[PDB]
Design a protein around this ligand. Structure first.
Ligand code: DUP
Ligand code: MG
Ligand code: NA
Ligand code: NA
Ligand code: NA
Length: 317
DNA sequence: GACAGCGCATCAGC
DNA sequence: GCTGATGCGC
DNA sequence: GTCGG
């Protein structure tokens, strides 16, 4: 409905994050994009948009320009700028952020060809990010997410029947495509009260050749790469990003709330929590920080901060 | 003035 | 090695 | 960049 506007704000957001290194402006543009994306009318003016929370006079002015011309002069200049363009590109590699991107550009490394000739200047994460550059920008159709879910849940069951694996992220929100796979893992042996629980699962998924690379790995978070098996004579599936989080079993609901997102939804809800005198993270909700409050469902967390319960499908902001 | 909150990798200082 | 800061991404 | 105190 307002895709031209939300695309423009997202591009500005990315500019402020990647080039300007202004994270609060990035968050401000993303907030405006999100609230406009949810607005059920085709916006006719900057004035109309400015009635929405997160849209102020400056973004209102840009919407007026965009509506009038179909363009934004600010963005056309940014697109023409070689340095901005180089930095924006390099940050598309997983593991290259705003700072490393600017450093690479300084060193004359500013293209895919340059990165490929300079893998020795990349850390492990960046090297895998470059290896799968193309694959990682592809979306994952839900049909493939279902097959991936089936592999993960069954391999986890083979390790220990007491594991429970839940696929979260956009998938759990019902999305027809996902950017990656997010898995929440619990085991009754691991609670907030009291080894290798994550390792055992990762090793099993590597053994069956589902997990193909590791970006980072600790005792509670694994970030890596996976791939569906393909049939005889068929083109291979793209490699995909997968994250697995080991969550204390008694903190499952705070965990699944966090890992279901969206990210802007969590930011909104946590910010609203502070206004109501609570702080929420992926483990607990605590009063303003006191002792953790009892949580027996996702809805309980909504109740504390006086929000009507919203199903996962309605948290995609 | 504050902006959500945190895990892992990596570096500096000791 | 350990602690704390920073970068990066979820 | 936006906004509540
Ligand atoms: O900055 C963040 C990023 C992620 N998260 C949480 C919510 C998000 O839904 C979950 C997984 O992050 P992803 O980057 O995978 N986003 P998501 O699965 O929602 O969308 P996509 O389909 O693009 O992967 O982690 C945050 O709370 N803050
Ligand atoms: Mg995801
Ligand atoms: Na507004
Ligand atoms: Na990046
Ligand atoms: Na993710």
């Amino acid at each position: 409905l307002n895709g031209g506007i939300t695309d423009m704000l997202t591009e500005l957001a990315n500019f402020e994050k990647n080039v300007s290194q202004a994270i609060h402006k990035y968050n401000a543009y993303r907030k405006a994009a999100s609230v406009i994306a949810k607005y059920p009318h085709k916006i006719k003016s900057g004035a109309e948009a400015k009635k929405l929370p997160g849209v102020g006079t400056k973004i209102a002015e840009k919407i007026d320009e965009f509506l009038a011309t179909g363009k934004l002069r600010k963005l056309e200049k940014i697109r023409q700028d070689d340095t901005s363009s180089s930095i924006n590109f390099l940050t598309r590699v997983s593991g290259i952020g705003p700072s490393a991107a600017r450093k690479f550009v300084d060193e004359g490394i500013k293209t895919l060809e340059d990165l490929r000739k300079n893998e020795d200047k990349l850390n492990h994460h960046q090297r895998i990010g470059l290896k799968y550059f193309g694959d990682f920008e592809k979306r994952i159709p839900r049909e493939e997410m279902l097959q991936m879910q089936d592999i993960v849940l069954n391999e986890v069951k083979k390790v220990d029947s007491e594991y429970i694996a839940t696929v979260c992220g956009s998938f759990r929100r019902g999305a027809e495509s996902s950017g990656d796979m997010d898995v929440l893992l619990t085991h009754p042996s691991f609670t907030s009260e009291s080894p290798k629980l994550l390792h055992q699962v990762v090793e099993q998924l590597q053994k069956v050749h589902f997990i193909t690379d590791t970006l980072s790995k600790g005792e509670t978070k694994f970030m890596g790469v996976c791939q569906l098996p393909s049939k005889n004579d068929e083109k291979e599936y793209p490699h995909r990003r997968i994250d697995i989080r080991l969550q204390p079993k008694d903190q499952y609901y705070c965990g699944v709330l966090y890992f279901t997102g969206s990210d802007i939804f969590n930011k909104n809800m946590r910010a609203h929590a502070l206004e109501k005198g609570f702080t929420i993270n992926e483990y607990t909700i605590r009063p303003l920080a006191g002792e953790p409050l009892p949580v027996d469902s996702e809805k309980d967390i909504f109740d504390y901060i006086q929000w009507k319960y919203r199903e996962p499908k309605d948290r995609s902001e």
